[PDB]
């Protein structure tokens, strides 16, 4: 299990804390869940184990996957396309606070607080489509899941999720 380091990124190991940096943004993550030694050869990071438990087999893959998520996230983006299917719908707000109105004919102006590092572009290029941008894959995925779960159904038309995109 080897993964080369991209050019321009500075990834370091400090008590299993990764501080992935780039000219367009910085991301951080804690790894107090893996018992695999981390080494650097000056051009590639290596994971080392010595006859551990069987859970370490999944630990290596999880560490490789999250390090790959950080590597793609520091350079590229995580564009999220939210589609609205229906009773009219609208999202008129400013800043990092997103407000949704007229859900199934309701009148409550329920508000949503976005996670740190997430900036919805709120562009109206495509009808009933919302573009969500966030450098942290975990945070943007949690935010998108929260948005979908906020609009729930009781005593049963609906709104579902859509595909994703790419930025940077």
Partner RNA sequence: AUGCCGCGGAGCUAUCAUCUGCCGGAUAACGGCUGAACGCCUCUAAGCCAGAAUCCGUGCCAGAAAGCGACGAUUUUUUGG
**Interaction site with RNA (CB under 7 A):** 32-33, 54-55, 57-58, 61-62, 65-66, 69, 137-138, 141-142, 145-146, 149
How far apart CA 39 and CA 2 sit, in angstroms, is 11
Q: How far is the CB of 42 from RNA (least distance, A)?
A: 27
User: How many Cα atoms occupy the beta-carbon half-sphere of 82 within 13 Å?
Assistant: 23
The nearer residue to RNA, 43 or 149, going by C-beta atoms, is 149
How far apart CA 167 and CA 73 sit, in angstroms, is 10
* 90 Cβ contact partners less than 8 Å away, ≥ 6 residues apart: 101, 102
Q: How far is the CB of 112 from RNA (least distance, A)?
A: 11
Sheet containing strand 37-40, edge to edge, reads 2-4, 44-48, 37-40
The nearer residue to RNA, 45 or 63, going by C-beta atoms, is 63
Q: How far is the CB of 124 from RNA (least distance, A)?
A: 25
Q: How far is the CB of 8 from RNA (least distance, A)?
A: 22
């Amino acid at each position: 299990e080897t993964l080369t380091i991209p050019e321009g990124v500075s990834v370091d190991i400090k008590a299993r804390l990764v501080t992935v940096k780039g000219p367009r943004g910085v991301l951080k993550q804690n790894l107090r869940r893996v018992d695999i030694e981390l080494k650097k050869q000056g051009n590639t990071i290596k994971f080392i184990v010595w006859h551990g438990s069987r859970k370490h087999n999944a630990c290596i893959r999880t560490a490789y996957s999250i390090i790959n998520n950080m590597i793609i996230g520091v350079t590229q983006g995580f564009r999220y396309k939210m589609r609205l299917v229906y009773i009219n719908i609208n999202l008129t707000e400013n800043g990092t606070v997103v407000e949704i109105r007229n859900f199934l004919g309701e009148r409550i102006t329920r508000v949503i607080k976005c996670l740190p590092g997430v900036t919805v572009s709120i562009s109206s290029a495509v009808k009933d489509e919302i573009i969500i941008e966030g450098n942290s894959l975990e945070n943007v995925s949690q935010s998108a899941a929260n948005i979908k779960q906020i609009c729930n159904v009781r005593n049963k038309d609906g709104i579902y999720v859509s595909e994703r995109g790419n930025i940077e």
